[PDB]
Amino acid sequence: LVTGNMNKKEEFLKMMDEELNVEFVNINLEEIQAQDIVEINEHKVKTAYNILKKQDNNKNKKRYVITDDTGLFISKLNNFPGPYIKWMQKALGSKGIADVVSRLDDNTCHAICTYSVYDGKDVHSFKGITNGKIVEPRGNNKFGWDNIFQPESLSKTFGEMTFDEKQNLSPRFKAFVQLKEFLMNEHKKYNNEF
Amino acid sequence: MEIYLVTGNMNKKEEFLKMMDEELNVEFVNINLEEIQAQDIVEINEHKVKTAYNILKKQDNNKNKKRYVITDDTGLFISKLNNFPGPYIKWMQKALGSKGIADVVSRLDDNTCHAICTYSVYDGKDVHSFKGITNGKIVEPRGNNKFGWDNIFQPESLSKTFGEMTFDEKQNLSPRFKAFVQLKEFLMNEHKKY
Structure with missing residues (x-):
């Protein structure tokens, strides 16, 4: 039980990692309001650990x-x-968010994904950022707001990509890669000490 | 009986006292409380009062x-x-400010909205919540601007924002006054039993 991850909607970690074994638990986590996404997620990971x-x-x-x-x-x-x-996506949906942004002076945005890991004593957080643009929906529409997010200077949305092109621009992947190197440096440190 | 309103805001304290009109003795306590994320504002406030009660x-x-x-x-x-x-x-207000929210709302098909104030009371065993609701429009900031987004809320059919309005003009109109008179009736009812 060395590595536990929590979701029910997500099979990205599967494909993202192969060098370590991981477990998947589903808990109904209460999130808090704060300004910093990292604050919300560190509180969530500690909360989940304690549960x-x-x-x-x-x-x-x-x-x-x-x-x-x-x-x-x-x-x-x-x-x-x-x-x-x-909450905005629940209220407006991808189409509603895109129609709001088409009424603003420009459609630039950025998406941040953060992983937080807790071992009972230490918390670590890793964030991936990808600049992009809100555009009118294209592509798959069951992946939340992927269909309206057009990364960098590309002409596709995340909803129009699969895993070859998406991963390289995915803020989740950018973050995950930091998290993997930390987990592996802890597993390697553990093994040298035996 | 012993009643506590939680606030550290001196303005909110005096407005409450004046709403109460010495009908009930109310004590104030300045406690920072966390706000969970949830769909419904009442669910947020109810969790918050239960927390305040336990602290x-x-x-x-x-x-x-x-x-x-x-x-x-x-x-x-x-x-x-x-x-x-x-x-x-x-969190929208902190990001955009009153001027920014009015500017954003003025780009949508209409600027209609509604505001909701909620009071939640908890005695250790039972929680009761009271929702005051008022329809309005988001307009360019007007009036006092140190009261959050009052200065852009124009209650429906009127030509003044809450920031320009007096205490007497808010009676039977402000979402807070609507919620307060429900709360006060509940507290008075609980007082007959004492």
Whole structure:
């Protein structure tokens, strides 16, 4: 039980990592309001760790628990909604967000994904940022706001990509890669000490 | 009986006292409270008052028969943002300010919205919440500007924003006054039992 990750909607970590084994737990986490996405996610990961601690596996050795969170920061909303994108997406949907942005002076934005890992004592966070533009929906529409996000100077949306091109621009991948190197440096450190 | 409104805002304190008109003795306590993320503002405020109650109760080393703790929370619900930001208004306000929100709303098909004030009271066993709701329009800032987004909320059919209006003009109109008179009736009812 050395590495625990939490979601029910997500099979990205599967394909993103192969050098380590990982477990997937589903907990119903209460998020808090704050200004910094990292603050929200570190609180969430500590909260989840504690729930995993008091329930069942209360007796064991070092355990790593991981949560993620994504924000969408829209330039002409002065970087709103950030970590509240999921309430905006619930209210407006991809089409509604794109129609709002088509009424602003420009459509530039950026998406941030953060991983946070907690071992009972230490918290670590890794964020990936990808600049882009809100555009009218294109591509798959079951992946949230992927269909309206057009990264960098490209002509596609995330909803129009699969995994070859998406990964390289995915803020989640940029973040994950930092998280993997930390986990592997902890696993390597563990093994040298035996 | 013992009633506590949670606030550190001196202006909010005096407005409450004046609403109460010496009908009930109300004490104030300045406690920072975390706001969870949730769909409904009442769910947010109810969690917040239950938290405020427990912080006060553990501190006091007391247990009273009846002790009433009250928190409030407000939201701005913009019609052409499909009622977003709602309870997240203050993160929009911090990002964009009053001028920025008015500017954004003026780019949508209309500037209609509604504002909601909520009071939640908790005695340790039962939680009760009260929702005051008022329709309006988002306009260029007008009046006092140190009261959050009052200066851009123009209650429906009127030509003044809340920032230009007096206490008497808000009676039966301000979402806070509507919620307060419900709360006060509940507290008065609880007082007959004492």
